[model samples]
Target: SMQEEDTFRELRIFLRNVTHRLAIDKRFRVFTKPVDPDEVPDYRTVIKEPMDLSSVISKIDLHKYLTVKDYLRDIDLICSNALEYNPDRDPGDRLIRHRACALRDTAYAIIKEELDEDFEQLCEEIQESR
Candidate 1:
């Protein structure tokens, strides 16, 4: 149980640190596919690799959900088995915090940056297109 708590806590801490770096790094850009001058930016934005989930996690209590304090030993046990399948769940497939962090790091390694959208009108244009 303590180990599970420790593992998640460590992951949370790692995610927090990487997210902080992402916020400051000028190269960590977020944009959407540009349309013609007559058109608008895509609302259905396809974020490039390295999608940061910091803002999403900031809205929740991750420690409570994934810590031993919850006394969800079954969850802990499942995590343990999963770790074996992918050692410590080192590289989760979806939008886990560590994956977000890894994505940023990988993007940096590949000389790339993340992208999203800003304007609602642009979003509407893309949505209307669809």
Candidate 2:
């Protein structure tokens, strides 16, 4: 039971960190609707840095761990917390959008801090070898 609880707690913290970073990155800004659900938005237009978390997070849970089942629960918590200051709002406005953009850039910086040395070395080699 303790292990389960610990897993849950740790997962919560991880998700919160992700959500906070995402929020700051401006990814939390859902436009008139959730990006049409089918069409893919171009990250080159918005995201300062390319997202490459496939190796780190899961496509199903959007998290790195497979044991966590409270993924959606964590998302709900994040969205609610993110929108606490503004009620009855869609967060599709310019001010929030700008804030989200700043957040997104900050998140990229944070993520870059955790870049694996091997990945960095590979990237450097690729760049230099070119």
Candidate 3:
């Protein structure tokens, strides 16, 4: 029970952080739809419903999901640059880097789990088409 609780807590935190970043990032603008400037952008409003992880695995586009993961990786690298040889860097900057890494790792884990399960389905489809 404790492990399950931890998993859920971690997932919620990860989703919240990732979605918040996606809302702000210019590179991810296409993935999100326009929202009222007066209101906070909810994850449901930002991410396309069909692209949501709760959707059927067969419906997900692995290429697009991987592209998101790659973007997170790019963010992680940029965050890392802030910490290098900069002993005078603010501790808050270090914290940002840490959070960025967690978001990247969480995204990769979620995508990989789905890919592992759905990869066979993709391969079968490819073979059939051939």
Instruction: Estimate TM-scores for all models.
Output: 0.33, 0.29, 0.31
RMSD of each: 19.3, 13.0, 13.3
Mind giving the per-residue lDDT tens digits that candidate 3 earns over 65-123? Answer: 22233334444543343334223557855564555455455556655664344443543
Question: Which regions in candidate 2 have their CA more than 4 angstroms from the true location?
Answer: 1-92, 120-130
RMSD of 2: 13.0
List the candidate numbers ranked by TM-score, top first.
Answer: 1, 3, 2
Q: Look at candidate 3 and tell me the lDDT of residue 128.
A: 48
- Winner on TM-score between 1 and 3 is 1
Error of 3 at 2 (Å): 46
| TM-score for candidate 2 | 0.29
Q: What TM-score does model 1 achieve against the real structure?
A: 0.33
Off by over 4 Å in 1: 29-41, 45-53, 59-130
Best by TM-score: 1
lDDT of 1 by residue, 66-88 (tens): 32222223223322322232334
Residue 91 alpha-carbon offset, candidate 3, angstroms: 1.6
